[PDB]
């Protein structure tokens, strides 16, 4: 997001009229902020909103978010969804058998778990993640998480005491 | 997130133009001129809500003075007589009695006359 200041608005180089004698207010440029078509004083400028949250804080928040619905019994683990070739009908079933429809799926296998990924990709009430990208926002937004066996194993292996 | 001022701005203007809905000239048509009079109106109303006590007490005292002087007794002697007799009927009820129940007011005048120090 960006705006043009009085220095960036086109024109406005010269004094509009003499300082005295005209009976008009003293003006310095036609692009002064109080003019129609003039520059914006404190309008937005491009920026980044990223915050340097500590690693321990980010990880712990993730642990607490996962733990709340672990205690609430909202994590299921499946060996996999779908067999052979890949449909969305199959996994829709596997998950509806699990429970409800505000879902998170973990399949971790970042390179070749196309079967499960592309099956659950189009549900629109399922969010699919790799185990190395769980993140607190998605965990909190999820009403339940279903891990693939490999997904849970890889998350545990990536972070364990 | 550019914000346009009009929707929020008009609220106080409508309030003030409603508050100034009997004024003469610009004071009931123009928000800026109505705003100046509403400040004066609020100051006058606050001042007059406290001066009203004195105004009505003065009216009651004048009516009591007239009613008691009709009985040959000044207001000060009448009030001192009531105070000595121990009748704590106030300026207000006394004025209402004077206007409405003149016989009861005259009986109170007799009470004050009897309760006078006579000195």
């Amino acid at each position: 997001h960006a705006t043009k200041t009085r220095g960036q608005v086109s024109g406005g180089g010269k004094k509009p009229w003499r300082q005295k004698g005209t009976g008009r207010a003293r003006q310095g440029s036609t692009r002064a902020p109080q003019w129609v078509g003039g520059g914006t004083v404190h309008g937005p400028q491009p920026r980044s909103y990223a915050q340097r949250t500590p690693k321990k804080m980010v990880g712990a928040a993730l642990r607490g978010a996962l733990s709340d619905m672990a205690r609430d019994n909202r994590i299921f683990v499946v060996t996999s969804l779908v067999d052979g070739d890949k449909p969305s009908t199959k996994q829709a079933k596997a998950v509806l058998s699990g429970l409800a429809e505000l879902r998170k799926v973990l399949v971790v296998l970042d390179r070749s778990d196309e079967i499960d990924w592309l099956s659950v990709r189009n549900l629109s009430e399922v969010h699919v993640l790799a185990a190395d990208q769980l993140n607190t926002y998605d965990v909190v937004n999820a009403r339940t998480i279903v891990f693939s066996q490999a997904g849970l194993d890889a998350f545990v292996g990536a972070r364990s005491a | 997130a550019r914000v346009k001022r009009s929707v929020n701005a008009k609220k106080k203007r409508r309030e003030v133009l409603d508050q100034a809905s009997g004024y003469r000239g610009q004071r009931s048509r123009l928000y800026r001129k109505a705003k100046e009079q509403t400040l004066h109106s609020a100051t006058y109303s606050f001042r007059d809500r406290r001066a009203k006590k004195g105004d009505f007490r003065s009216l009651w005292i004048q009516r009591i003075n007239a009613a008691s002087r009709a009985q040959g007794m000044t207001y000060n002697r009448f009030i001192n007589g009531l105070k000595n007799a121990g009748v704590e009927v106030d300026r207000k009820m006394l004025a209402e009695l004077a206007v409405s129940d003149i016989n009861a007011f005259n009986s109170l005048v007799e009470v004050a006359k009897a309760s006078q120090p006579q000195n």
């Binding site: - | 004048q62 009516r63 004025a95 209402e96 206007v99």
Partner: protein
Amino acid sequence: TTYSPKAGEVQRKWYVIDAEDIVLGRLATTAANLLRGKHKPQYAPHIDTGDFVVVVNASKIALTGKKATDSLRYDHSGRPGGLRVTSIGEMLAKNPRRAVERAVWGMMPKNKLSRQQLKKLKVYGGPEHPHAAQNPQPYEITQIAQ
């Protein structure tokens, strides 16, 4: 709610005062009180509740000291050198009604209602007044003890 008179609710009476040997100040205070109706328990500043006052023998109003020739009355026409001055004795001799009206008006509030009420004062320098039809009752200037 305090009582308030309603237009013609209070009935206005007619009094007559013989200004024979009565000081101008006392006469004017009494006239102002009667005209404004301050002796009535129904008094209200905003509604005329007073009575009509007919003053007779205004030419025989008593004055103390050297007022009859040293107490001056001034009028100005509103133009340069437009002052006239006459002593209260001369004014009582010539136009007593003007003198009594000036005194009463000075003692009466400065109001549109006061201007209206001052018309209720009928001043005559002689002992006779033409308002027998209105049947004015005699009024005696008195004082209440203590």
